[PDB]
Design an enzyme around this catalytic site. Sequence first.
Site, PDB file in Angstrom:
ATOM      1  N   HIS A 242       0.835  -1.197   0.000  1.00 46.18           N
ATOM      2  CA  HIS A 242       0.000   0.000   0.000  1.00 46.18           C
ATOM      3  C   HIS A 242       0.878   1.259   0.000  1.00 46.18           C
ATOM      4  CE1 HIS A 242      -3.000   2.945   1.042  1.00 46.18           C
ATOM      5  NE2 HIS A 242      -2.453   3.148   2.226  1.00 46.18           N
TER       6      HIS A 242
ATOM      7  N   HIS B  31       0.749   4.792   1.241  1.00 45.95           N
ATOM      8  CA  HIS B  31      -0.048   5.507   2.237  1.00 45.95           C
ATOM      9  C   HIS B  31      -0.289   6.944   1.869  1.00 45.95           C
ATOM     10  CE1 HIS B  31      -1.571   5.596   6.544  1.00 45.95           C
ATOM     11  NE2 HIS B  31      -1.516   6.885   6.262  1.00 45.95           N
TER      12      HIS B  31
ATOM     13  N   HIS C 213       3.957   0.492   2.738  1.00 49.12           N
ATOM     14  CA  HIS C 213       4.070  -0.639   3.671  1.00 49.12           C
ATOM     15  C   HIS C 213       3.193  -1.802   3.230  1.00 49.12           C
ATOM     16  CE1 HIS C 213       0.123   0.218   5.499  1.00 49.12           C
ATOM     17  NE2 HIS C 213       0.436   1.467   5.218  1.00 49.12           N
TER      18      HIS C 213
ATOM     19  N   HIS D  61       0.464  -4.498   3.234  1.00 48.54           N
ATOM     20  CA  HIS D  61      -0.900  -4.424   3.785  1.00 48.54           C
ATOM     21  C   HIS D  61      -1.572  -5.796   3.990  1.00 48.54           C
ATOM     22  CE1 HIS D  61      -4.656  -2.380   4.741  1.00 48.54           C
ATOM     23  NE2 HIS D  61      -4.011  -1.230   4.642  1.00 48.54           N
TER      24      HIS D  61
ATOM     25  N   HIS E  74      -6.044   5.184  19.521  1.00 48.11           N
ATOM     26  CA  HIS E  74      -6.044   4.498  18.214  1.00 48.11           C
ATOM     27  C   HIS E  74      -5.989   5.460  17.035  1.00 48.11           C
ATOM     28  CE1 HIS E  74      -7.322   0.745  20.238  1.00 48.11           C
ATOM     29  NE2 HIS E  74      -7.963   1.591  21.027  1.00 48.11           N
TER      30      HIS E  74
ATOM     31  N   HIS F 147      -7.033   5.545  10.088  1.00 48.98           N
ATOM     32  CA  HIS F 147      -6.602   6.015   8.779  1.00 48.98           C
ATOM     33  C   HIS F 147      -7.699   5.737   7.756  1.00 48.98           C
ATOM     34  CE1 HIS F 147      -4.444   6.331   5.018  1.00 48.98           C
ATOM     35  NE2 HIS F 147      -4.478   5.022   4.826  1.00 48.98           N
TER      36      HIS F 147
ATOM     37  N   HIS G 140      -8.323   5.322   3.792  1.00 49.15           N
ATOM     38  CA  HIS G 140      -7.693   5.132   2.483  1.00 49.15           C
ATOM     39  C   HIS G 140      -8.368   5.942   1.377  1.00 49.15           C
ATOM     40  CE1 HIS G 140      -5.044   1.444   3.011  1.00 49.15           C
ATOM     41  NE2 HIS G 140      -5.606   1.573   4.201  1.00 49.15           N
TER      42      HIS G 140
ATOM     43  N   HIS H  49      -9.408   1.787   8.848  1.00 50.50           N
ATOM     44  CA  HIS H  49      -8.934   0.906   9.935  1.00 50.50           C
ATOM     45  C   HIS H  49      -8.053   1.640  10.880  1.00 50.50           C
ATOM     46  CE1 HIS H  49      -4.874   0.666   8.172  1.00 50.50           C
ATOM     47  NE2 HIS H  49      -5.471   0.462   7.008  1.00 50.50           N
ATOM     48  N   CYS H  50      -7.960   1.157  12.119  1.00 48.82           N
ATOM     49  CA  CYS H  50      -6.954   1.701  13.034  1.00 48.82           C
ATOM     50  C   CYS H  50      -5.588   1.297  12.486  1.00 48.82           C
ATOM     51  CB  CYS H  50      -7.147   1.199  14.470  1.00 48.82           C
ATOM     52  SG  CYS H  50      -5.700   1.545  15.572  1.00 48.82           S
ATOM     53  N   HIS H  51      -4.609   2.203  12.465  1.00 54.88           N
ATOM     54  CA  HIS H  51      -3.364   1.877  11.780  1.00 54.88           C
ATOM     55  C   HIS H  51      -2.378   1.154  12.662  1.00 54.88           C
ATOM     56  CE1 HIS H  51      -0.391   1.822   8.637  1.00 54.88           C
ATOM     57  NE2 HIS H  51      -1.142   2.580   7.852  1.00 54.88           N
ATOM     58  N   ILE H  52      -2.755   0.902  13.921  1.00 53.61           N
ATOM     59  CA  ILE H  52      -2.000  -0.026  14.768  1.00 53.61           C
ATOM     60  C   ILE H  52      -2.185  -1.433  14.229  1.00 53.61           C
ATOM     61  CG2 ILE H  52      -1.722  -1.061  17.014  1.00 53.61           C
ATOM     62  CD1 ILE H  52      -2.986   1.539  17.995  1.00 53.61           C
TER      63      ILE H  52
ATOM     64  N   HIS I  54      -4.027  -4.205  15.720  1.00 60.83           N
ATOM     65  CA  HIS I  54      -5.446  -4.057  15.870  1.00 60.83           C
ATOM     66  C   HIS I  54      -6.121  -4.380  14.566  1.00 60.83           C
ATOM     67  CE1 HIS I  54      -4.544  -1.141  19.393  1.00 60.83           C
ATOM     68  NE2 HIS I  54      -4.203  -2.398  19.641  1.00 60.83           N
TER      69      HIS I  54
ATOM     70  N   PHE J  56     -10.249  -4.532  13.450  1.00 58.71           N
ATOM     71  CA  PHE J  56     -10.726  -3.219  13.785  1.00 58.71           C
ATOM     72  C   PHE J  56     -10.776  -2.376  12.518  1.00 58.71           C
ATOM     73  CE2 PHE J  56     -10.162   0.337  17.182  1.00 58.71           C
ATOM     74  CZ  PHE J  56     -11.554   0.382  17.348  1.00 58.71           C
TER      75      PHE J  56
HETATM   76 CU   LIG Z   1      -6.111   0.498  17.385  1.00 61.96          CU
HETATM   77 CU   LIG Z   2      -0.356   3.173   6.143  1.00 60.72          CU
HETATM   78 CU   LIG Z   3      -3.372   4.359   3.486  1.00 64.08          CU
HETATM   79 CU   LIG Z   4      -4.523   0.604   5.390  1.00 63.11          CU
END
Ligand SMILES: [Cu+2]
Ligand SMILES: [Cu+2]
Ligand SMILES: [Cu+2]
Ligand SMILES: [Cu+2]
Length: 502
Positions: free
Chosen positions: A64, A66, A109, A111, A400, A403, A405, A455-458, A461, A466
């Site tokens: 992906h 970002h 990164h 995905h 949290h 993000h 997309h 989604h949460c980017h952690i 998670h 999530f």
């Molecule tokens: Cu999270």
């Molecule tokens: Cu990202």
């Molecule tokens: Cu992204």
């Molecule tokens: Cu993503």
Amino acid sequence: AIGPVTDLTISNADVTPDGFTRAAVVANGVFPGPLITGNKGDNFQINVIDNLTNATMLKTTTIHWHGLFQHGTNWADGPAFVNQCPIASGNSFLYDFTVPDQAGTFWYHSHLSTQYCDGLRGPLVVYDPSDPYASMYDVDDDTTVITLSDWYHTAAKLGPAFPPNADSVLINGLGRFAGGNASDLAVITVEQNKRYRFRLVSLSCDPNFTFSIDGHNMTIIEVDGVNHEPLEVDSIQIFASQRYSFVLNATQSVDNYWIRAIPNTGTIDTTGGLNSAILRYSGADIVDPTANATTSVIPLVETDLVPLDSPAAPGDPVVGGVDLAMNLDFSFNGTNFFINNETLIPPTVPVLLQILSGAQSASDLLPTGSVYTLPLNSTIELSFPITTVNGVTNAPGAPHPFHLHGHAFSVVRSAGSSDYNYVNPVRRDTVSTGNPGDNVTIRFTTDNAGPWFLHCHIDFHLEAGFAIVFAEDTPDTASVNPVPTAWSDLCPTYDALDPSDH
Ligand SMILES: [Cu+2]
Ligand SMILES: [Cu+2]
Ligand SMILES: [Cu+2]
Ligand SMILES: [Cu+2]
Ligand SMILES: *[C@@H]1O[C@H](CO)[C@@H](O[C@@H]2O[C@H](CO)[C@@H](O)[C@H](O)[C@H]2NC(C)=O)[C@H](O)[C@H]1NC(C)=O
Ligand SMILES: *[C@@H]1O[C@H](CO)[C@@H](O[C@@H]2O[C@H](CO)[C@@H](O)[C@H](O)[C@H]2NC(C)=O)[C@H](O)[C@H]1NC(C)=O
Ligand SMILES: *[C@@H]1O[C@H](CO)[C@@H](O)[C@H](O)[C@H]1NC(C)=O
């Protein structure tokens, strides 16, 4: 570094960034992956070659990009089973997208699940040949990208579902741990009187950093790609996947200073040379900095950040004053996270493919209860309340950083505050949802056809599900996004693979 047309060679190799050697998944051999460079309006073509042999870190991959909107190129977005099937080992795949309306700092990164924590992460910079801030700084290049990354001695699949802390914090890919080898630190060189544009990237999986430099200041001009009005700052709280560009005025005596990146969780302490990098004025001795960290009186506050251009948020200034308002009810059952009583367990057929297969309504999209349909040219308001409940507190693991997309959103209500800002709120691609009592609310307009991930980017998670997907303008998805042959070849080629070759 590389780009705008190039190959990413992805391979399993042992790497030792913190004094500790462990096998990882890496792009072009070096971790973090090589800086990909391009200019506004440049057509990126990245041939991702998958050469992975380690099953435990996944032989299949997907990358992906970002913060890149990916108009007309929704296939090239990255997310596994949302936008594409993962690339098989031994094969190659080209990500062919143009970036016409975007200028600033991003990162790329993997995905697929938690692969990127295992190493497949690198910075990505788009430069603006007419950058409204070029008369602010003297240097902006490869040696001005500062990459913050959390590092783990145990592998993603091998350790626990939710790792409590990182073993080391790596700046530019170099850091140390507790009982540390006391090995090499990161060395950022500067010349006296010369302005520097530093592009700060958070390739973190979990922890958020309080980034600071000893005896210096940061002038933020850019947050998550988007150009913003210049801000006087001492320390930057940068959550996972966020980016900041700050111009540092090299005005201090020729000395070694500490570049500090304290995480919120884990081993918080500069003693040992942990969580540190070296800021070295050209001509000072090749020694470790003796500089001390002062208290922060002018720190980064989100609510203070104002967008440089088109600052007003879409929708009329009212709570609810928007075309489609949606609130996300969070919860956690011990292993999995839940948005609206549902968790993202990734479907066999990608969300994208499903629409190209003729699926249209939210009832017909998979996974069920997790794909929301959004009409175009309508304005959307999302809200992420972290509540304390009766005595339960939904969504632990706070704060949290969520993000979205394919969109840059206006954060009308930030963490830590309850005031709403509609006149000139900050505009970014990932915001912290904060601590209990924060009803973080964001707004963005539906100007992009295709399926998008929220989604949460952690990353841990994310793997807990999530997440939800926005099927934005389903009728035009098919047409507005022309899919290349390589992309459609992916799912039949991937489903043929054994779990062993996964
Ligand atoms: Cu999270
Ligand atoms: Cu990202
Ligand atoms: Cu992204
Ligand atoms: Cu993503
Ligand atoms: C494939 O990758 C994994 C994980 O990256 C390697 O697992 C290591 O295994 C040894 C012995 O079980 C452990 O002491 C290490 O803790 C593991 N590494 C990590 C990061 O957890 C495994 O060695 C790899 N296989 C090969 C040889 O490529
Ligand atoms: C978080 O904020 C949102 C609105 O921005 C709240 O959601 C609305 O709450 C009102 C009551 O004040 C309802 O009548 C609306 O129907 C809600 N919107 C929906 C269903 O999307 C939300 O309740 C706030 N969370 C908390 C509990 O603080
Ligand atoms: C938690 O939820 C997940 C997915 O919905 C499920 O696999 C697991 O069985 C659940 N745990 C409990 C409390 O039953």
